[PDB]
Design a protein around this ligand. Structure first.
Ligand SMILES: *[C@@H]1O[C@H](CO)[C@@H](O)[C@H](O)[C@H]1NC(C)=O
Ligand SMILES: [Ca+2]
Ligand SMILES: [Ca+2]
Ligand SMILES: [Ca+2]
Ligand SMILES: [Ca+2]
Lengths: 276, 48
C-alpha cells in the first residue's frame, strides 16, 4: 500500500515455517522454455510440445502454462530478447568461437538493466561508474569510439574523421561496450540498423535461468576481470540427444525453479520504484 | 581510289581529306586513373 518508500521490516526468529508453496506457484505461474531450432530439428516430432506439456503436468504444471519459444541461434536471439513468462529457462548451445556473444547474452538476460536512449549524433557520452555500460542491439551494430580530453579534442583519433575512431564492435547483433569511466567519447554507431542505449546494471534478474548445453564454464556476466561468478541461474549440461536434454529439464524443473525467484522488479510490491 | 588512274581498290585512309567534311571525330568512354597525390587526410592541421 505504501509504494514509494522503503520501510524496514522486522521479522522474528522462531517464526514457524510456512508449508511448501511449490505446488501453488506451479499452479499459478507460467514457464517459458527457450530452445534453438536445431533442438526441434533433431527431435523430429511434430507433437513433442504436447508430450513435454503432459510430462510437465505429471510434474505439477497445469497443461496450459508451459510455453515453448524457438529461436534460430544465439546471435539472432540476442536482438531484443523478450522474456515475458513468470519463469524463463533458456537452453543455449555452446560454441567455442562464440564465448563473448554467449557471455553478452547472459549478461543481458540474467541481469536487470535500466536503459536510457542515446543520441550519438548529438551528445558526447561518458560512463559514470562501473555499473554503467553501453548496450547495443540490431541486425548489424558496428561501434567505434573516440575518447576526448578535457579540451574536447580526441585522444588517438580525430573527431572529424571517423576513420581514426577506435573500433570496439563489428557486425554485432548484441554488444555490451565498457569504456573508461569519467571520459567523454564521441560515438560512431551504425544507427541505421542498430540501437544503442546507455544502461545501468540494477541487479540480478531472478526469473531467467540459462542452461549452457555442452560446453565449459566460460560465461562472464560481469565486465570486471577479477570476477567471473557462476550464479545459481547459470547451469551447464552435457548432451548428445536433445530429447535427453529436455527430459532432464522436465525432471529437474523443481530444482530449476528453486534456483530462480519471482522477478523482484515485477509484481505489485515493486510499484513506484521502477516498474509495477 | 583516285579517278582517271590505275591506282584503285587500296585499303586505308589517305591524307587528302581525312576530315571528310566532319568537323571532328568523336570517341567517348570511361577512363580510370590510379594515381598518387598529396593528401594528409585532414590530419596535418593545427591542434585547435
Ligand atoms: C500445512 O501442512 C500441515 C501438515 O501437512 C497441515 O496440517 C496444515 O493444514 C497445512 N496448512 C497450513 C496452513 O498449515
Ligand atoms: Ca556479440
Ligand atoms: Ca585512431
Ligand atoms: Ca566503464
Ligand atoms: Ca569478469
Amino acid at each position: 500500500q505504501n509504494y514509494g518508500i522503503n520501510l524496514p521490516i522486522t521479522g522474528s526468529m522462531d517464526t514457524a515455517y510456512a508449508n511448501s508453496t511449490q505446488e501453488e506457484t506451479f499452479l499459478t505461474s507460467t514457464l517459458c522454455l527457450y530452445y534453438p531450432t536445431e533442438a526441434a530439428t533433431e527431435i523430429n516430432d511434430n507433437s513433442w510440445k504436447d508430450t513435454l506439456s503432459q510430462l510437465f503436468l505429471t510434474k505439477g504444471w497445469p497443461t496450459g502454462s508451459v510455453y515453448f519459444k524457438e529461436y534460430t541461434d544465439i546471435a539472432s536471439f540476442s536482438v531484443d530478447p523478450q522474456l515475458y513468462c513468470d519463469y524463463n529457462v533458456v537452453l543455449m548451445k555452446y560454441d567455442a568461437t562464440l564465448q563473448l556473444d554467449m557471455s553478452e547474452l547472459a549478461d543481458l538476460i540474467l541481469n536487470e538493466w535500466l536503459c536510457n536512449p542515446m543520441d550519438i549524433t548529438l551528445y558526447y557520452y561518458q560512463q559514470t561508474d562501473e555499473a554503467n555500460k553501453w548496450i547495443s542491439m540490431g541486425s548489424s551494430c558496428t561501434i567505434k569510439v573516440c575518447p576526448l580530453n578535457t579540451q574536447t579534442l580526441g585522444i588517438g583519433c580525430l573527431t572529424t574523421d571517423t576513420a581514426t575512431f577506435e573500433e570496439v564492435a563489428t557486425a554485432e547483433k548484441l554488444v555490451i561496450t565498457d569504456v573508461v569511466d569519467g571520459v567523454n567519447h564521441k560515438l560512431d554507431v551504425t544507427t541505421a540498423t542498430c540501437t544503442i542505449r546507455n544502461c545501468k546494471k540494477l541487479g540480478p534478474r531472478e526469473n531467467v535461468a540459462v542452461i549452457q548445453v555442452g560446453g565449459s564454464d566460460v560465461l562472464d556476466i560481469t565486465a570486471d576481470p577479477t570476477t567471473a561468478p557462476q550464479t545459481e541461474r547459470m547451469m551447464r549440461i552435457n548432451w548428445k540427444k536433445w530429447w535427453q536434454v529436455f527430459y532432464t529439464v522436465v525432471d529437474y524443473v523443481n530444482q530449476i525453479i528453486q534456483a530462480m525467484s519471482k522477478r523482484s522488479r515485477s509484481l505489485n510490491s515493486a510499484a513506484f520504484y521502477y516498474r509495477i | 581510289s583516285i579517278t582517271r588512274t590505275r591506282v584503285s581498290r587500296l585499303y586505308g585512309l589517305p591524307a587528302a581529306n581525312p576530315n571528310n567534311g566532319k568537323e571532328y571525330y568523336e570517341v567517348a568512354g570511361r577512363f580510370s586513373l590510379i594515381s598518387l597525390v598529396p593528401s594528409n587526410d585532414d590530419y596535418q592541421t593545427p591542434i585547435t
